[PDB]
Ligand binder design. Structure first.
Ligand code: A1IKK
Length: 115
């Protein structure tokens, strides 16, 4: 089973758009982490493989995933990074949890269709 880039975009982009549509919860995740602007100078001591919504969107837009699981792995990498770095009481951690709840609901039927 070979997945063409347009077929992956058609199936998976709606699940990424669902996360962008969470406002304000997607705001911390819409651009690559910049620790100087965000005031978190130790970030890359903790997080070695950063990921954000715009990077995932570019990969889908340009055909960089060969298989649906690679896209799923990048979304969970984004979430796991934020749960790793942020305190459980923090706004970013709580926003991360809301996006993960949305993602689980949207991705389940789509992965069933691609499986
Ligand atoms: C996902 C990415 C990296 C991560 O994992 N955690 C952190 C930790 C932090 C921030 C983010 C993230 N988001 C990004 C947050 C969105 C708002 C940015 N901005 C725009 C609106 C006003 C304001 C005030 C204080 C501030 C950022 C901002 O920052 C204060 C210092 C501590 N700053 C974090 O504690």
């Amino acid at each position: 089973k070979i997945f063409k880039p347009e077929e992956l975009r058609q199936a998976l982009m709606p699940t990424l758009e669902a996360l962008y549509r969470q406002d304000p919860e997607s705001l911390p995740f819409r651009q690559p982490v910049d620790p100087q602007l965000l005031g978190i100078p130790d970030y890359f001591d903790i997080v070695k493989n950063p990921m954000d919504l715009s990077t995932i969107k570019r990969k889908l837009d340009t055909g960089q995933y060969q298989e649906p699981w690679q896209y799923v792995d990048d979304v969970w990498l984004m979430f796991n990074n934020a749960w790793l770095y942020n305190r459980k009481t923090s706004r970013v951690y709580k926003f991360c949890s809301k996006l993960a709840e949305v993602f689980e609901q949207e991705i389940d039927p789509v992965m069933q269709s691609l499986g």
